[PDB]
Subunit: 114 residues, 3 copies
């Protein structure tokens, strides 16, 4: 799985180990080994939510399976919780797009997962 | 909805009112409330279009509904126009991927829109 | 078609001409005209893969057609190869999400490909 967070908060706002926290929490949440989890955080972005340049974030979670209505709500609660606590971004200013990828459409190590 | 623009033009070439104009124009075109439109512009990127590096842009518009044949054609004309007018990016060096998101796959405020 | 590479490797480590290179190779691989191929490389990113911060990359290949079971296995072999050789990123630390786009959902030059 891979989780990407794009945000306008400054780099200094991202605590050391934040990437590791995301990795471990997502492993726990998705059930997949942390070793398969990739995380990417992009601060100091030029973005707005509702026209407002106050702190916000646009994210995406891609995963082969383990993506569904109820599961996504749980992921959102977890992820929004982390962003609020660690980056001080209000949950109502956070979007996370979820993607349930077919194993044939995810490349890794010279091949796919199909 | 959410609109992202990745471009190689210098940050100083991006008008300060661009995120606001994109927000207003997208509200106007999609019919979606502006308070829920998120916009993100990422300048100074290392990109190529057709193998060359003159100004170009790769974008994506994610929306729960309001995505389709005719709508996408109108958005493309609207957005290419704005990119040409404000960033001097030729329409022929712009790609816009449209995504009709299921509400269940859009996280926000500790939940989803479904 | 468009190919995007996000990596934590330094900008200085991205070889000169790498984008034009990718354009040519993707042209042959997909069979599409170079004029329609867009490439985007994002170095110096804050990311982790498997909880490790060693060189890694998260990539996307979007195309109208030319996406499938064996085609994606072949693209993976090729792209992981070029990344390994040119950016020195190990293939076990690279993910590539493949997207088969409907022509109606791809905007370009004030219109769509529908
Ligand atoms: C040796 C071994 O058992 N590894 C393992 C363990 C638990 C899993 O859930 C998967 C697993 C991993 C993926 N790979 C990705 C990227 O999700 C997909 C489906 C899976 O069941 C793989
Ligand atoms: Cl970190
Ligand atoms: Cl579910
Ligand atoms: Cl898929
Ligand atoms: Cl408002
Ligand atoms: Cl550069
Ligand atoms: Cl339509
Ligand atoms: Cl969706
Ligand atoms: Cl195939
Ligand atoms: Cl599509």
């Amino acid at each position: 799985p891979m989780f990407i967070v794009n945000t306008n908060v400054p780099r200094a706002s991202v605590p050391d180990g934040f990437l590791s926290e995301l990795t471990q929490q997502l492993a726990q949440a998705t059930g997949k080994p942390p070793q398969y989890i990739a995380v990417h955080v992009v601060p100091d972005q030029l973005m707005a939510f509702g026209g407002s340049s106050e702190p916000c974030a646009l994210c995406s979670l891609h995963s082969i399976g383990k993506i569904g209505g109820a599961q996504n709500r749980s992921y959102s609660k977890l992820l929004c919780g982390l962003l609020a606590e660690r980056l001080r971004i209000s949950p109502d200013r956070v979007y996370i797009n979820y993607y349930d990828m077919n194993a044939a459409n995810v490349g890794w190590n010279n091949s796919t997962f199909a």
